[PDB]
Nucleic acid binder design. Structure first.
Lengths: 88, 271
RNA sequence: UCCUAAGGUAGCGAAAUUCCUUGUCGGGUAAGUUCCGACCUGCACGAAAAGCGUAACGACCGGAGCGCUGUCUCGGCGAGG
RNA sequence: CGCAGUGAACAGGCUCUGGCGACUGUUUACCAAAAACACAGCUCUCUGCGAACUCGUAAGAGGAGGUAUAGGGAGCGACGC
RNA sequence: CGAGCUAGCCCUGGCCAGGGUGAAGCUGGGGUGAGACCCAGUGGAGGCCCGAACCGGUGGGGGAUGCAAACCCCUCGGAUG
RNA sequence: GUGAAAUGCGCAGAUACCGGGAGGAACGCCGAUGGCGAAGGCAGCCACCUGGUCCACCCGUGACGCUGAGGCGCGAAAGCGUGGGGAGCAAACCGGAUUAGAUACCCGGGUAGUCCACGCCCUAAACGAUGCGCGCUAGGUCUCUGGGUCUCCUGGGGGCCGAAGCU
RNA sequence: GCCGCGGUAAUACGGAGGGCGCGAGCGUUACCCGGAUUCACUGGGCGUAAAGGGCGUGUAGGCGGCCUGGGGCGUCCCAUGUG
């Protein structure tokens, strides 16, 4: 799975001000991590359709948010995407 | 994996070729042990005695090891998987610690860098060779001797195996690739695993040349000849054998059993 | 109802298979014993001596056009051996 | 500028529609090149290895320095259904 | 007695002017969650196409005490297998 | 074996019993008017990868929401393609019965198929025959699952009886 | 016209007597609106009547919690031109 540490490190690494556990920017980087980890999984177990569903649900979330983020702020919208590697 | 081609030509529509993932990173064969020139020659002292053989790409022979009990206890690293023209399975060149090198008919799973070893001691894993007694009943296994010390006779066609079925005194029950059930001596070596390059069955030759490249000359049907020529031969315009199908030599070829009745090989076979 | 070991399915069908036959209807033409599309009472198709189709291929065999012509109406003149 | 510019020479006539064979190929040297044989592919069958099978009185050799995903025999002959 | 013709196989050599078509793979872009895929550009595949040599022998004419005991002419098939 | 039979198997030694072995499918009891899943659907045991969900703490973001033409994915069984498997069961198919007839119902066999992989197919009484999200409008009864300074109170889910209302 | 009438006692056919309507007219056929809240904005629905998409994921679009100001396009009012 994704450990306590791997989780935290990402969080403290994407925060707006230490302590910030929610926030657009972080929420994203959570999923991204889960996704790639999941992305990676379905790539072996192609036949696991059920778990694929969830991915599509997250994928949306991520989108959903990014659109908010972009709407309020073009500045730290680049930041995130680029310092994270998405937009396909 | 079997490459399939786009139809930029008829014939190249049905033709499929092997993947060569298999072997990669080694083509020119091992000048050292590998080569004796192989002698093309489709019959004995004058007369053709296998019809329809001849032509097909000039071919060098790789000298493999079918008796691994020479090198008992000496491990070797698997150095490469290479192409063998002379059989359906692929071969692995392996360097013994000994210095000495040889080719084994490459079993499935086997990968460059692995170490492999033969003896009663050997770990029960891929490519290792062992007397049949010290091999656990249930494992599949190939390149099996039939009498001890006589060389590996069974299970060497691409993707073949046998399975250890039971023990029984000095002897040991074996299910063969045919489906036959045969006692083989305990000392008869065998190499754990099956053979691999098991897509081999699915090549679609693709056209009638190619068949020629592999040295297989065209085969003319019985009826299609005349009576001098064959049993089926003859008949005004097209014909229905006229009882019961037969080789050129005359002996029946639908259902007639041919193995020798009183063979001492009997008592050892059971299917 | 009688017989058989059991009585021809799918699909094809006047066919390289139809004797009667130039079967009969339709198409094509001024006029078509050939051709093409149909209908079956299939003398005597039929499933791996395959059944029915099939793009592409063919110095393979059939039937139409268009172009063009000494093939022909019908022959004439000329060159050379 | 000519009647004319691939100005001489080398240099495809095209179309519609059947039958057969899937295909490139092979054949009756010297009357038949095809709807014949071959063919990739489909099925049946034999063969456990001193294989079956073939040549040979034998020794021997082919099979095969192969081993059932491999070898012999037989029939149908891409593909679709 | 013959395989100095012809048929097959084995060993070792040599030959295929020049045109055309442009498979896969790469590269790039586009695409998506990742993909599939689509686009150019490159590339250079094939019992691929036109067509000499070379191999053949389709149709017609000629020859028929022949140039010839199978020849000549026009035409035609294959031409990296 | 049936309704009673017959086909069928058996003195060539069956059925019934014992021991040794092979192989495939499905997981008794637990098991329920139970649980999980968006649906189809998911049941012996073990381990790994992985989805959704619920409770509590009121910590963070600060309306970042709902729905969704088209697109995209999943989609029982049957069926199709290539290859593997094949014990049991079984369309077709064949035998025996019954019957006027019996291309059925019952009996004896039996081929695909049923299973594995990989790729197609895209339907259904795919049914709660009830699209999704939210707010509001008596309670009673039993049940699964969580949280509590646990005769009880609170949250999420599954049934039954029913206020108002609707029909 | 629709439901239907006529099989020996027909208020439904045909004639007759009488009667109702309208009248230089009266009937038929065709076609438009109406009745038809029977395409429903006004004004209909989909558990079993015809009607929930097999189920998800999401694009365009539709729609949008509480509070404070800036604008005033929708929205409302006034005059005036036109109509």
């Amino acid at each position: 799975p994704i450990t306590k540490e791997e989780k935290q490190k990402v969080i403290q690494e994407f925060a707006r001000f230490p302590g910030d556990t929610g926030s657009t920017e972080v929420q994203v980087a959570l999923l991204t991590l889960r996704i790639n980890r999941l992305s990676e999984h379905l790539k072996v177990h192609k036949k696991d359709h059920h778990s694929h569903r969830g991915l599509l649900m997250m994928v949306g979330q991520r989108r959903r948010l990014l659109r908010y983020l972009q709407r309020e702020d073009p500045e730290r919208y680049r930041a995130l995407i680029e310092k994270l590697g998405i937009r396909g | 994996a079997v490459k399939k081609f786009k139809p930029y030509t008829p014939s190249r529509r049905f033709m499929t070729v092997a993947d060569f993932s298999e072997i990669t990173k080694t083509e020119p064969e091992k000048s050292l042990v590998k080569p004796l020139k192989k002698t093309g020659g489709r019959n004995n002292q004058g007369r053709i005695t296998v019809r329809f053989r001849g032509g097909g790409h000039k071919r060098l022979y790789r000298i493999i090891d079918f008796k691994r009990w020479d090198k008992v206890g000496i491990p070797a690293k698997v150095a490469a998987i290479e192409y063998d023209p002379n059989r359906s399975a692929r071969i692995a060149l392996l360097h013994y610690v000994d210095g000495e090198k040889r080719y084994i008919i490459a079993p499935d799973g086997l990968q460059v860098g692995q170490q492999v070893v033969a003896g009663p001691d050997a770990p029960i894993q891929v490519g290792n060779a062992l007397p049949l007694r010290f091999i656990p009943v249930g494992t599949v296994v190939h390149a099996v001797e039939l009498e001890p010390k006589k060389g590996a006779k069974l299970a060497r066609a691409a993707g073949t195996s046998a399975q250890i079925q039971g023990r029984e005194g000095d002897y040991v029950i074996l299910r063969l690739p045919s489906g036959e059930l045969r006692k083989v001596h305990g000392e008869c070596y065998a190499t754990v695993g099956a053979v691999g390059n098991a897509d081999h069955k699915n090549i679609v030759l693709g056209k009638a040349g190619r068949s020629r490249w592999l040295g297989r000359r065209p085969h003319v049907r019985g009826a299609a000849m005349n009576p001098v020529d064959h049993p089926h031969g003859g008949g005004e315009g097209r014909a229905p054998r006229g009882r019961p199908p037969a080789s050129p030599w005359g002996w029946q070829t639908k259902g007639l059993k041919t193995r020798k009745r009183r063979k001492p090989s009997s008592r050892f076979i059971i299917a």
